[PDB]
Design a protein around this ligand. Structure first.
Ligand code: GDP
Ligand code: 4ED
Ligand code: CA
Ligand code: MG
Lengths: 422, 67
């Protein structure tokens, strides 16, 4: 029945994951205790996609919470919708990962990974027809980055024929915890290139700029940043969670969006970012605007391979179709000519909370290379002096593995530039 | 990839164990070298003082061979 298994790893992965569940539980009418109290059967028609039906007509998220320290997951359990999560699905260590990819991937995380897989297996076994997996994590830390990609590697071994997608938060010096973030990110990107079908690249620099420049927040917190991520994740999963014209699972959606296996790193977008409702032209304009992009990449610096757009709310579908056909025919130079009709649009009647109507952007642009270039610059800047490497070699890693990760991402960059000049 | 994961963690164990091994050996070398040196220092000191005894006995003996 097209069930999705959700996994969240690390500090960022769990805090963002929790907000996601907090938002969609509200949309489906599920209270923190797991009881349904909505007002429409449309909220329950595809409730099985992310929720398991309990004994007493309760709905428990198909989510698995992973960390190497209990700090963040204790905060989740003490949160608003904390009691909604299945207790056994809380898998945690005590040591922590210390913002170290090696600790998450090779030492500390390796000691815990089988425990997570047992929970994954337990959730998967009770699925009528498993649709795929979904991971929320950061790439700049240790747990979500190192253990997260290790989990993905394991899942692909046990479930080679299942879709593996991630919502990955990209590190940025503007919003940074440690200096080793480019090290952890480069190591993780190599894993994602090979072992995921779709990765939504969420840039913290972009999130910061949106909160500061647009949302007019002088001192943006992680909470403010996760508000944008939560709203985007809701929009991306809207067509999967609600009835509509679109009858597609993760695989079919992946087929129409990914023309080349390695090039599957998407730029998320959202509109609006107020009492005055937006018009369809305004939604479409903002949706394609760089200021609504969350990968911190300028789409004009590249070309769109494929584009997906999801509209929510009661609106003129003719006007939507006209406006989408307006942007494409006014900026046809930014869409590849060797992929006919690469821009697809879906509408959903049920709007998110607080907005009468909204729009979510999913772009497979070659401009995403700017993100990897940026990470690669920061990486090389330290690695040429072998700086901070002792943290990693102390966990058993060799310099060669760093050189290889560096080379694979430069290859990824070169691959993107290959189709930008096509 | 699995066997690489094994090689990394066992390399971490090997390096940590070698560090402990080296530290234990270097320390055992130093405390032993120090013990030998300090004993030899006091051995030489007492031998000089025991030489003064040999000289003192000859002094009393030399006077005895004058009476
Ligand atoms: N958007 C967002 N980013 C975060 C959050 N927490 C940490 N990060 C980012 O993630 C990186 C740190 O990784 P973290 O998840 O804290 O370490 P982990 O627990 O080992 O996975 C840094 O680049 C932070 O900017 C959060 O709540 N929201
Ligand atoms: C063409 C098209 C593609 C598409 N892909 C989507 C992805 C959904 C998803 C949700 C969770 C995890 N991974 C993927 S929504 C969507 C809507 C349209 C029109
Ligand atoms: Ca341990
Ligand atoms: Mg942290």
């Amino acid at each position: 029945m097209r069930e999705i298994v959700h996994i969240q790893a690390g500090q960022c992965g769990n805090q963002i994951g929790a907000k996601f569940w907090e938002v969609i539980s509200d949309e489906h009418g599920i209270d923190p205790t797991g009881s349904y109290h909505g007002d429409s059967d449309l909220q329950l028609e595809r409730i099985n996609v992310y929720y398991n039906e309990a004994t007493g007509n309760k709905y428990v998220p198909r989510a698995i919470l992973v960390d190497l320290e209990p700090g963040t997951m204790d905060s989740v359990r003490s949160g608003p919708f904390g009691q909604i999560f299945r207790p056994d699905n809380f898998v945690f260590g005590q040591s922590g990962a210390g913002n170290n990819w090696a600790k998450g991937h090779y030492t500390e995380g390796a000691e815990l990974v089988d425990s997570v897989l047992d929970v994954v297996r337990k959730e998967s076994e009770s699925c009528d027809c498993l649709q795929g997996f979904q991971l929320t994590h950061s790439l700049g830390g240790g747990t979500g980055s190192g253990m997260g990609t290790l989990l993905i590697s394991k899942i692909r071994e046990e479930y080679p024929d299942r879709i593996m997608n991630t919502f990955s938060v990209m590190p940025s010096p503007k919003v940074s915890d440690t200096v080793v973030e480019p090290y952890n990110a480069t190591l993780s990107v190599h894993q994602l290139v090979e072992n995921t079908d779709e990765t939504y690249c969420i840039d913290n620099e972009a999130l910061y700029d949106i909160c500061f420049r647009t949302l007019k927040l002088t001192t943006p917190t992680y909470g403010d940043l996760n508000h944008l991520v939560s709203a985007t994740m809701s929009g991306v999963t809207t067509c999967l969670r609600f009835p509509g014209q679109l009858n597609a699972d993760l695989r079919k959606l992946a087929v129409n969006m990914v023309p080349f296996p390695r090039l599957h790193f998407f730029m998320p977008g959202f509109a609006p970012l107020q009492y005055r409702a937006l018009t369809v032209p305004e939604l479409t304009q903002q949706m394609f605007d760089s200021k609504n992009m969350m990968a911190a990449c300028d789409p004009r610096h590249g070309r769109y391979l494929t584009v997906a757009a999801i509209f929510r709310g009661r609106m003129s579908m003719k006007e939507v179709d006209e406006q989408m056909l307006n942007v494409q025919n006014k900026n046809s130079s930014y869409f590849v000519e060797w992929i006919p009709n690469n821009v697809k649009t879906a509408v959903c009647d049920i709007p998110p909370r607080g907005l009468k109507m909204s729009a979510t952007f999913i772009g497979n642009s070659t401009a995403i290379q700017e993100l990897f270039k940026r990470i690669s610059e920061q990486f090389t800047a330290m690695f040429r002096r072998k700086a901070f490497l002792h943290w990693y070699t102390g966990e058993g890693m060799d310099e060669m593995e760093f050189t290889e990760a560096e080379s694979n991402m430069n290859d990824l960059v070169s691959e993107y530039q290959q189709y930008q000049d096509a | 990839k699995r066997e690489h994961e094994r090689e990394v963690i066992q390399k971490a164990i090997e390096e940590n164990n070698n560090f402990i091994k080296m530290a234990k050996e270097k320390l055992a070398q130093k405390m032993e070298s120090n013990k030998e040196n300090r004993e030899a220092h006091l051995a030489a000191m007492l031998e000089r003082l025991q030489e003064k005894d040999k000289h003192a006995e000859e002094v009393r003996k030399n006077k005895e061979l004058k009476e």
